[PDB]
Design an enzyme around this catalytic site. Sequence first.
Site, PDB file in Angstrom:
ATOM      1  N   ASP A  50      -2.712 -11.414  10.434  1.00 42.46           N
ATOM      2  CA  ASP A  50      -4.097 -11.015  10.455  1.00 42.46           C
ATOM      3  C   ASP A  50      -4.145  -9.784   9.543  1.00 42.46           C
ATOM      4  O   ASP A  50      -3.349  -9.730   8.604  1.00 42.46           O
ATOM      5  CB  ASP A  50      -4.515 -10.708  11.916  1.00 42.46           C
ATOM      6  CG  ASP A  50      -3.882  -9.491  12.588  1.00 42.46           C
ATOM      7  OD1 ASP A  50      -2.660  -9.448  12.746  1.00 42.46           O
ATOM      8  OD2 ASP A  50      -4.632  -8.581  12.943  1.00 42.46           O
ATOM      9  N   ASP A  56      -0.809  -6.763   4.862  1.00 42.66           N
ATOM     10  CA  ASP A  56       0.094  -5.755   4.326  1.00 42.66           C
ATOM     11  C   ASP A  56       1.381  -6.337   3.736  1.00 42.66           C
ATOM     12  O   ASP A  56       1.925  -5.826   2.753  1.00 42.66           O
ATOM     13  CB  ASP A  56       0.408  -4.747   5.429  1.00 42.66           C
ATOM     14  CG  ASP A  56       1.080  -5.236   6.697  1.00 42.66           C
ATOM     15  OD1 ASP A  56       1.244  -6.435   6.920  1.00 42.66           O
ATOM     16  OD2 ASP A  56       1.448  -4.370   7.476  1.00 42.66           O
ATOM     17  N   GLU A  79       7.494   0.972   2.493  1.00 42.30           N
ATOM     18  CA  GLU A  79       7.469   1.123   3.934  1.00 42.30           C
ATOM     19  C   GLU A  79       8.036  -0.148   4.594  1.00 42.30           C
ATOM     20  O   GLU A  79       8.847  -0.069   5.508  1.00 42.30           O
ATOM     21  CB  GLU A  79       6.022   1.379   4.362  1.00 42.30           C
ATOM     22  CG  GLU A  79       5.610   0.981   5.802  1.00 42.30           C
ATOM     23  CD  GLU A  79       5.137   2.100   6.731  1.00 42.30           C
ATOM     24  OE1 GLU A  79       4.393   2.992   6.305  1.00 42.30           O
ATOM     25  OE2 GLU A  79       5.508   2.058   7.904  1.00 42.30           O
ATOM     26  N   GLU A  80       7.664  -1.333   4.095  1.00 47.00           N
ATOM     27  CA  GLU A  80       8.037  -2.627   4.670  1.00 47.00           C
ATOM     28  C   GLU A  80       9.505  -3.032   4.582  1.00 47.00           C
ATOM     29  O   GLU A  80      10.012  -3.767   5.427  1.00 47.00           O
ATOM     30  CB  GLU A  80       7.235  -3.755   4.014  1.00 47.00           C
ATOM     31  CG  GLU A  80       5.724  -3.600   3.873  1.00 47.00           C
ATOM     32  CD  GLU A  80       4.963  -3.595   5.179  1.00 47.00           C
ATOM     33  OE1 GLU A  80       4.992  -4.609   5.878  1.00 47.00           O
ATOM     34  OE2 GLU A  80       4.345  -2.574   5.477  1.00 47.00           O
ATOM     35  N   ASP A 100       3.879   3.096  -0.172  1.00 47.23           N
ATOM     36  CA  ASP A 100       3.355   2.525   1.034  1.00 47.23           C
ATOM     37  C   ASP A 100       2.286   1.556   0.538  1.00 47.23           C
ATOM     38  O   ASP A 100       1.254   2.011   0.032  1.00 47.23           O
ATOM     39  CB  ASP A 100       2.725   3.589   1.892  1.00 47.23           C
ATOM     40  CG  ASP A 100       2.309   3.120   3.281  1.00 47.23           C
ATOM     41  OD1 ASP A 100       2.063   1.935   3.530  1.00 47.23           O
ATOM     42  OD2 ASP A 100       2.202   3.964   4.153  1.00 47.23           O
ATOM     43  N   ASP A 103      -1.437   1.611   3.788  1.00 48.16           N
ATOM     44  CA  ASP A 103      -1.440   2.626   4.834  1.00 48.16           C
ATOM     45  C   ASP A 103      -2.510   2.344   5.882  1.00 48.16           C
ATOM     46  O   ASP A 103      -3.660   2.339   5.439  1.00 48.16           O
ATOM     47  CB  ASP A 103      -1.669   4.006   4.148  1.00 48.16           C
ATOM     48  CG  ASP A 103      -1.913   5.170   5.107  1.00 48.16           C
ATOM     49  OD1 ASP A 103      -0.960   5.600   5.750  1.00 48.16           O
ATOM     50  OD2 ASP A 103      -3.055   5.631   5.224  1.00 48.16           O
ATOM     51  N   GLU A 262       4.610   8.867   1.862  1.00 47.67           N
ATOM     52  CA  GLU A 262       3.330   9.229   2.437  1.00 47.67           C
ATOM     53  C   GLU A 262       3.343  10.735   2.241  1.00 47.67           C
ATOM     54  O   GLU A 262       2.701  11.209   1.304  1.00 47.67           O
ATOM     55  CB  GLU A 262       3.246   8.859   3.927  1.00 47.67           C
ATOM     56  CG  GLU A 262       3.485   7.370   4.274  1.00 47.67           C
ATOM     57  CD  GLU A 262       3.280   6.982   5.735  1.00 47.67           C
ATOM     58  OE1 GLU A 262       3.416   7.817   6.616  1.00 47.67           O
ATOM     59  OE2 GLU A 262       2.965   5.836   6.022  1.00 47.67           O
TER      60      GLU A 262
HETATM   61  O1  LIG Z   1      -3.469   7.844  15.856  1.00 49.25           O
HETATM   62  P1  LIG Z   1      -2.618   8.757  14.989  1.00 49.25           P
HETATM   63  O2  LIG Z   1      -1.191   8.938  15.478  1.00 49.25           O
HETATM   64  O3  LIG Z   1      -3.297  10.091  14.717  1.00 49.25           O
HETATM   65  O4  LIG Z   1      -2.398   8.004  13.560  1.00 49.25           O
HETATM   66  C1  LIG Z   1      -2.931   8.559  12.353  1.00 49.25           C
HETATM   67  C2  LIG Z   1      -1.932   8.343  11.252  1.00 49.25           C
HETATM   68  O5  LIG Z   1      -1.289   7.066  11.407  1.00 49.25           O
HETATM   69  C3  LIG Z   1      -1.466   6.260  10.237  1.00 49.25           C
HETATM   70  O6  LIG Z   1      -2.557   5.394  10.381  1.00 49.25           O
HETATM   71  C4  LIG Z   1      -0.203   5.432  10.044  1.00 49.25           C
HETATM   72  O7  LIG Z   1      -0.551   4.045  10.030  1.00 49.25           O
HETATM   73  P2  LIG Z   1       0.507   2.911  10.441  1.00 49.25           P
HETATM   74  O8  LIG Z   1       1.374   3.544  11.476  1.00 49.25           O
HETATM   75  O9  LIG Z   1      -0.182   1.635  10.760  1.00 49.25           O
HETATM   76  O10 LIG Z   1       1.342   2.654   9.110  1.00 49.25           O
HETATM   77  C5  LIG Z   1      -1.764   7.265   9.123  1.00 49.25           C
HETATM   78  O11 LIG Z   1      -2.403   6.608   8.050  1.00 49.25           O
HETATM   79  C6  LIG Z   1      -2.600   8.315   9.852  1.00 49.25           C
HETATM   80  O12 LIG Z   1      -2.585   9.625   9.282  1.00 49.25           O
END
Ligand SMILES: O=P(O)(O)OC[C@H]1O[C@](O)(COP(=O)(O)O)[C@@H](O)[C@@H]1O
Lengths: 317, 316, 316, 317
Positions: A50, A56, A79-80, A100, A103, A262
């Site tokens: 999905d 991704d 990242e993957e 990444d 993201d 990141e």
């Molecule tokens: O709910 P949280 O922990 O604040 O997450 C925010 C952070 O997590 C992220 O969404 C990471 O995304 P993913 O873990 O899906 O790769 C960042 O883009 C963002 O800064």
Amino acid sequence: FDTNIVTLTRFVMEQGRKARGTGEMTQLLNSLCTAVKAISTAVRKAGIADQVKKLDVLSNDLVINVLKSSFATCVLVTEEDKNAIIVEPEKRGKYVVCFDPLDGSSNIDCLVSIGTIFGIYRKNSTDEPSEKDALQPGRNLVAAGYALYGSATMLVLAMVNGVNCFMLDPAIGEFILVDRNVKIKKKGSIYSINEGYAKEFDPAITEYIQRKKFPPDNSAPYGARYVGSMVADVHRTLVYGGIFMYPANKKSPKGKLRLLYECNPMAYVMEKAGGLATTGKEAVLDIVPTDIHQRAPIILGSPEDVTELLEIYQKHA
Amino acid sequence: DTNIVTLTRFVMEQGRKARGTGEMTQLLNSLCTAVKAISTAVRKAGIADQVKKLDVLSNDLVINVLKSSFATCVLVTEEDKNAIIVEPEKRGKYVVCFDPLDGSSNIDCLVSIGTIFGIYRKNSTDEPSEKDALQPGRNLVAAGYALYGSATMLVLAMVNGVNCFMLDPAIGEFILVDRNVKIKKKGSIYSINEGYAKEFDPAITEYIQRKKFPPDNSAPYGARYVGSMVADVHRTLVYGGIFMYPANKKSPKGKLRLLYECNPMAYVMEKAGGLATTGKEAVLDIVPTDIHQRAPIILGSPEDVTELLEIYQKHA
Amino acid sequence: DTNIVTLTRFVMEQGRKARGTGEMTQLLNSLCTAVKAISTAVRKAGIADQVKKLDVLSNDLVINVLKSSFATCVLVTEEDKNAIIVEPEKRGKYVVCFDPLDGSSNIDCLVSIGTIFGIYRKNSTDEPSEKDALQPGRNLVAAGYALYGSATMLVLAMVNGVNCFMLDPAIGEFILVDRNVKIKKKGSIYSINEGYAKEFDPAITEYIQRKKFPPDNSAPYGARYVGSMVADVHRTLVYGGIFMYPANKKSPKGKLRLLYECNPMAYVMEKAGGLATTGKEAVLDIVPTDIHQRAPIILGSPEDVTELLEIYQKHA
Amino acid sequence: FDTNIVTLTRFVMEQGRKARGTGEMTQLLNSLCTAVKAISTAVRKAGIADQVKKLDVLSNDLVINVLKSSFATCVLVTEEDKNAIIVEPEKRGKYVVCFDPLDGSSNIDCLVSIGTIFGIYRKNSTDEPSEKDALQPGRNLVAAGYALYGSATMLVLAMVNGVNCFMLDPAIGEFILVDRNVKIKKKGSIYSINEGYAKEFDPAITEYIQRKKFPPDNSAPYGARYVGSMVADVHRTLVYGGIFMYPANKKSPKGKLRLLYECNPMAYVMEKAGGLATTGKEAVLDIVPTDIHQRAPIILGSPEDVTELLEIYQKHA
Ligand SMILES: O=P(O)(O)OC[C@H]1O[C@](O)(COP(=O)(O)O)[C@@H](O)[C@@H]1O
Ligand SMILES: O=P(O)(O)OC[C@H]1O[C@@](O)(COP(=O)(O)O)[C@@H](O)[C@@H]1O
Ligand SMILES: O=P(O)(O)OC[C@H]1O[C@@](O)(COP(=O)(O)O)[C@@H](O)[C@@H]1O
Ligand SMILES: O=P(O)(O)OC[C@H]1O[C@](O)(COP(=O)(O)O)[C@@H](O)[C@@H]1O
């Protein structure tokens, strides 16, 4: 139509000729721009075709294929992928890209803006390329940046020169230069942090947040803003100013965000725009990596603001 | 695909069931043309101020498309002091209150923004006036918003439910992607601008504390606050949670305007199974006395809004 | 721009004047959705047979959009043996004869192709049948074509005239660009497939000779023949001239089908001031006996079609 | 979306690496592709935003600016400019491009398909660049081709290798490889010529046309097809086969079409696809130019067919 459009490719080239440098970088970023346009179209029709997982993976495959075909890279960290990808001999070039691909892929379901983040290192060693080439400190980045897929697709590119913003013209499929030498506000008025984690913040963060909510010098408090998507909150911090914080907490003792693709791309963009990026202790751009998927705390933004939190970090040490 | 359900097909089939006139289909067809044009404007808003100028053009465009639908008689805008009374030549039965580009300031930070609208039916027999717009939100016939984000989404709420239509950019047509959306009963996210912490009334202040530091040791809530009502409300709809913009004393009546920001969002929520309250009464039952009146709003998943209501009881 | 005249706005305003029901607006609104989708398909027809498969999907799409308009009862297609009778649930008053992608063979050579349509009103009271489609073209209520070329163009002819709408790809909306198009009285171009020179009846054969070698020493005509009826007819409309597809003996009745190729094009021409003839009678007055009947057609600027008619007199 | 798209840039590069050649060519054709997408969008909204004259001037300016900024050209010949454009020293590169920016601009009013035609020469001399560099015979073309703006935008590129067709994906703004090593049919079944000029054709043309209309061996006659736009009729001749003829006539005693940027690009595309292109006397690709806007008769198409007309040219000599 304008008969004199400054596309990303033309810009990079006019600056490249100016330094009689690389050439390969233009093939690299041009290939990256193709991947970015394809992911932008895919996100824009996301629910008609999905999200969290699958889109991704497809983005990951597309960025790897176009980077391999630019004849400008030798090592790719994603990242993957658990291990770093080494390019075929005939296709190799001098660069290491850490990226990444998408993201925040979860956030698509809620139509929250997300992005692609990338770091570009030059392979310094004379040895056969290996993940060892990816483990350079952030200060060694040749170029870094992100693509934000929001109400418009913005590609922000920080190079030695400074920060330049480019916007995708949907009609001709070209990123057009729209802001030229970006510098962040010295102090801001917004702080961005997930306060659901308050129960586990370190005393320095905690003191700073309440000092933004209840300002000691009896001034106006800071506004809160937290999109929950790093590319969206760092792009707002860059244009509007303020500070973005993802410190360490319980489930994220060394921070959450990955250092190579990141934290370091955003930190290089932020310092090239006159802002600061720190762990709370060292500057993010000086951390020599150990593991390609190593994590780091990051605090970035307007110089005056990051400094205030560093002073508070000094106090409780 | 051969048989595509567009917003026009959906609204026309629904309209047939009412043994109506076609005016609502005329109206939402026009509105879609404005929404597509505002979407393209924001998608290249930057290739060239864009707050004052783009919200002005967005406002002129929506009034123009609504007047030519032969479906409206009173139009209330965020941008206009008084209600716009449609010329006799072009008049129809519906009243439309709309915010043409909510959070137009946010375009510089590429924050998702959108158009919000509430549609009433003029019931009286005298000349159209802004008094036909002064009805409780309980009486909206239709309401929704278009979100200009990574994709453009039109969420439409009517008596039969909430449906979501995505703009297919290739054919310029809103396609039905989600049918009768229901919100989940309890969620994991709370949205509020905590930068106003000094000014919160103690009921809000207690609930926030409770979501960060759970008494029954339950997992704490995540915090999300885009700073754009359509993006925060849309996430609250899709993911569940609670969105709050109560009186922050500087705004003792709240910030958000009742007729074109609070009431459409509240009608959408109630139609999806959520609740919307000022903390003292349901916003859909507030009787407006001014077309630009503000209200506090707390909306989202039922259990979470109920929990905040109990904390409001316990603050006497 | 704030006030844009779309095909929907134009047809709705016109329809108001007839004190009608809204069905024609429903119908052409649906048709536009199919035209936009076929346009996007042809614009990327190649990024991957595309004759049999793309004309099939084009045909299924148009029948689907027309059935859901609640405006049609009989649909005649180039692609279908018999007329399609719309289900009682979805029936309305109009009969539509259409060619969904004329010259679908031409897509490989990137030749402009298009959709042609003629709309009748069923007048009788018995069950819909293909006999409601068997009316003279003189009785078409509306007719036109959409050209998928460097731009997608919808030319629409009704009682009040011929108007041209261009597809704006950004907002997916047909915008009125040319109002009440009239053809010029005499033109400079003749179109015909001269590869059939052996088979031409001597009246055609004389006129062609006369256009290449002018007796009154006047400047000779230019020759243009795209090989696609919509592109040749559209140029004849815009630039003036004569387009001919008479009986080439292999086709003793002509090639082009009467109800969905000759009659729409002929109604457009007459509404723009041109003429359309078989060389023996006006095609709009031919009474059809079969829905897939062919006719010869010669249409274009009045003086040029009149000149060919005189040469036909002089061939006894 | 496909995660492995063969864009024009990637194609040219995989073939370029294969020969460890130029690099500059990729910057050149990539810049040309930007101009081509901008003109395609402009033509597609042409009547909503005259055509005959003005839009072609704007196309001319855009193709000149992007070619100068590719750092790959030194001399540019246009249909629009009387004299050849010499590039600024700092922007110069090794190529000479001869181009028609918008072939048939009149035809827009009638929505007839039109195109951009280009020839790419390598500057052979060591002297300061001058229009003299543009006057090479067609056989010296490094690359040539056209963009057809029709129901879809097609960029056809002929290089030493052969003919490759690319189609613009409107969604991501990229020309995608859709046909890979094009070869025209040995004989065809269509002849394309403006027969309004019959009164002034030379006896060879005249004999051939009536032999196509009344076939001597009592076979089926040829079909006629004539769009009145060179790019449209040559693209149909390439995909379907047949012969396209614009010989000389009264107002065009040396033919109408310009040699450097209409006749020679199409002739190189046609011979690289296995077809022939002749004046009726010499092969078009051998004519040493004299004036940059010199005209030539051209007859091009399927080998068997062009040969039949050359035999008939022998008979009346
Ligand atoms: O709910 P949280 O922990 O604040 O997450 C925010 C952070 O997590 C992220 O969404 C990471 O995304 P993913 O873990 O899906 O790769 C960042 O883009 C963002 O800064
Ligand atoms: O930052 P604070 O003061 O909480 O306000 C943000 C709210 O204001 C908004 O009305 C946006 O402001 P504007 O619509 O007036 O541009 C609403 O969309 C946001 O949720
Ligand atoms: O090449 P000739 O035999 O003259 O036929 C071309 C005509 O045929 C067409 O009907 C196209 O053929 P199809 O519509 O059957 O694909 C009409 O559009 C053309 O003018
Ligand atoms: O009417 P004619 O002389 O056959 O013209 C056809 C030829 O003229 C052209 O349209 C030339 O166009 P322009 O003269 O406007 O540049 C060619 O593209 C085409 O092959």
